[PDB]
Design a protein around this ligand. Structure first.
Ligand SMILES: Nc1ncnc2c1ncn2[C@@H]1O[C@H](COP(=O)(O)OP(=O)(O)O)[C@@H](O)[C@H]1O
Ligand SMILES: Nc1ncnc2c1ncn2[C@@H]1O[C@H](COP(=O)(O)OP(=O)(O)O)[C@@H](O)[C@H]1O
Ligand code: BEF
Ligand code: BEF
Ligand SMILES: [Mg+2]
Ligand SMILES: [Mg+2]
Lengths: 417, 49, 417
């Protein structure tokens, strides 16, 4: 059956299921290797397996169906996709495909997908006759995505502050500029939880690049939705692989008129990997970055856009500063001008155990009038007018005190009265 | 270049799927023999110590 | 037929037209790829296609007819131009050429232009016997280009203020020095709209380099005229390509005695791209810029001039400050002395929600007496005399209040009485 159906559960149920299948000792091999052996036996029972995965296209023309729980990486259960399907339907990268698969005969490699039964949770007829992603008409954020939870938690403020600092909507391009040891982890955590709880209609796609495996395990089983990540366990090759794969999945899902939130941390390590995997042009820039090292990062960053026809792609990629060297800062610079949504976090206030320390001054949103109603916009303008003339510490303590003294944001408006 | 159609599922889709499977098997077997002969003729030969 | 005639319309009409042509599924390939396939079929019908485009010359000697809607970039519908045409007429870069084209036979690349029928909206005889651009006699701005709209909008002031701060005319060289988050976007928007509405005689050519795709879509379908842009989706190579191509198109159009307004934003990203695409001379300047990295930017900037014989080229390139580093500021410096027209915008007043925040003090125009009549010049001198001794905030609030209290500029003169 489905691989993810065997993947949601730990290795223990896989071991007892393999014992039901009557095979060699399963616990010895890896759990994904266990799944490979188990699907091989299930196919030996004389039935066609039903598999699913997102497509990865190599130079040869065939495809691989990378699974969600395998972090969109190379695995023994990556379904081989013959080029004939790419000739008939021309399924591009990131297309979630589900269909019938057969076992690999000897001297082969993996399972082969015979016939597609589901293309991106839709009929296969829509796959061939469809308007493409880079072919769309990009626009600004029209619909507002509220962030406050509504029951008044302590980190619920961490969402409210955004709704009070700069709104966030569909199709936006958001940056999180923060130094190390500032509070980005818990911030994106409660951001994802609030998006999932208050707006369960949109597709939450949290992303993690080069962090601690404990952080990956804390992120995967805390938030709603798919959690694909690539820690330092994988080199720049697998980093760029998972990055382009999730971005193409988002492109296809927006092509199918659906909203995709991509919370990525951090963009600077992604840029480092990109600069690592670019050919040398015989010259270096300021900080130690190749010339063409920014083209593909800029493509990946600008993939986010709001569409006239349907769907949206909103990415929130965290920028890292205070690294001591120049190149990272260079990345940050090359990224302030491309994104139309900035959000800056404070470490000088975070060291004072003052959370959340968001830079209310340099935060902002372009075309933010489309992100909030009329009189709420007037009141936010007046509130920023009040926040401006006071000091940094003044504004921040006023924020934290008077918002913890409140429960929700409109209640905050009605209390400022 | 057009195996792609759909109507009157009960039989038409059954036989169109069978013919699609035959076409895919033919193409895959032919490209497999292709790559096999490729790697055979490109594999260098032993000459002498 | 004409490619732009198929390009003004979305991919939907292209899809149904290809279905009329009886081809493979068109929606699968890109819409410009759709146009390529459609023109191939149209040529298969036994007719000579009529194409048009601006010329791009490579080292080999042949040419490419880049189309307007393709942002003057590489495309499958770029008409090949045999060297024989460059031997007969010697069409230089930027020459808008229209003529008969044939389909590409197999093993070829693209459509080939057989015979030219229109050279820069004129007979081909004027193409060979013509005086060149760098061969002209540069002069100052003689004719004044008024900016006020005339019906009294809120952003109409954003034009009036220019006519009240420093006039703008044909052949001028304008700089817009402004920090990020200041109001340059809407400014150049209403500037283009006012030039188009009040002065529809001149050729409006708005330019955009490395911005958001949503900004490109907002600019293309809001203003009158051709809108070629190159966002961050393209590296420095395509940036310098589109830049030199539009500048050569403007050169040719001025050679044909026509006025070309080039609103570019920003010049600093163009300078960054140029510094990225220059050979290293084994030394770096202050800020991190190569020695010869400024030669070609200076050429592109000084291409603007007013001509004795006919036509004008007036560029308004926005300069970016407050970027934290030196190199950008360096660019700004190297650009204050070459342009004869400065215009400075305020962010310290823009953060106060005070728009439009133009620096009335450091704005100015060289030889501005040729840009305005006698008594209006006296009155502007007296008005600047009045504006000088008061503070910055004083001058700016006086400006915004008393000009929103007015409707037009001569009405403003008659109210100050
Ligand atoms: N909203 C918050 N409330 C309380 N503590 C917080 C909050 N945000 C961050 N912290 C503190 O930050 C620490 C974790 O920092 P972390 O988020 O890993 O750094 P970074 O901001 O660089 O991601 C925790 O020990 C926690 O006490
Ligand atoms: N004439 C104006 N009237 C009202 N608001 C303006 C005006 N000009 C600029 N703005 C404000 O500026 C913001 C956009 O600034 P933008 O042009 O992107 O900055 P930059 O000058 O860095 O390009 C908008 O949110 C808008 O509120
Ligand atoms: F220390 Be943080 F995770 F950058
Ligand atoms: F961010 Be602005 F366009 F300088
Ligand atoms: Mg962290
Ligand atoms: Mg701007």
């Amino acid at each position: 059956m489905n691989l993810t159906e065997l993947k949601n559960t730990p290795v223990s149920e896989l071991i007892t299921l393999g014992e039901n299948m009557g095979l060699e000792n399963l616990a010895r091999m890896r759990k994904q290797d266990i799944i490979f052996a188990i699907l091989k036996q299930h196919a030996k029972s004389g039935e066609d397996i039903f598999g699913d995965g997102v497509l990865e296209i190599l130079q040869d023309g065939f495809g691989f169906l990378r699974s969600a729980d395998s972090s969109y990486l190379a695995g023994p259960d990556d379904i081989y996709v013959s080029p004939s399907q790419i000739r008939r339907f021309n399924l591009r990268t990131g297309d979630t495909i589900s269909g019938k698969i057969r076992p690999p005969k000897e001297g082969e490699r993996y399972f082969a997908l015979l016939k597609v039964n589901e293309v991106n949770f839709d009929k296969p007829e829509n796959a061939r006759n469809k308007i493409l992603f880079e072919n769309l008409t990009p626009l600004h954020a029209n619909s507002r995505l509220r962030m406050e939870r509504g029951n008044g938690s302590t980190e619920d403020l961490t969402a409210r502050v955004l709704d009070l600092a700069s709104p966030i909507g569909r199709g936006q391009r958001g940056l999180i500029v923060a130094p190390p040891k500032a509070g980005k982890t818990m911030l994106l955590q409660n951001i994802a939880q609030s998006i999932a709880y208050n707006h369960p209609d949109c597709v939450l796609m949290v992303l993690l690049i080069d962090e601690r495996p404990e952080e990956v395990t804390e992120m995967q089983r805390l938030v709603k939705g798919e959690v694909v990540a690539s820690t330092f366990d994988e080199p720049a090759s697998r980093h760029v692989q998972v990055a382009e794969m999730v971005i193409e999945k988002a492109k296809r899902l927006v092509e199918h008129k659906k909203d995709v939130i991509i919370l990525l941390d951090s963009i600077t390590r992604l840029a480092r990997a990109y600069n690592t995997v670019v050919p040398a042009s015989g010259k270096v820039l300021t900080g130690g970055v190749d010339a063409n090292a920014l083209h593909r990062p800029k493509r990946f960053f600008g993939a986010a856009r709001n569409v006239e026809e349907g769907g949206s792609l909103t990415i929130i990629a965290t920028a890292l500063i205070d690294t001591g060297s120049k190149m990272d800062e260079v990345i940050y610079e090359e990224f302030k001008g491309t994104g139309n949504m900035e959000l800056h976090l404070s470490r000088k206030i975070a060291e004072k155990r003052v959370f959340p320390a968001i830079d209310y001054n340099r935060s902002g949103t372009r075309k933010e009038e489309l992100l909030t109603t009329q009189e709420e916009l007037q009141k936010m303008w007046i509130l920023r007018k009040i926040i401006h003339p006071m000091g940094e510490i003044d504004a921040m303590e006023f924020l934290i005190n008077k918002l913890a003294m409140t429960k929700t944001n409109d209640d905050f408006f009605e209390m400022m009265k | 270049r057009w195996l792609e159609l759909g109507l009157t599922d009960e039989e038409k889709q059954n036989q169109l799927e069978q013919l699609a499977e035959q076409y895919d098997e033919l193409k895959h077997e032919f490209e497999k023999k292709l790559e096999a002969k490729r790697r055979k003729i490109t594999q260098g030969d032993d000459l002498a110590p």
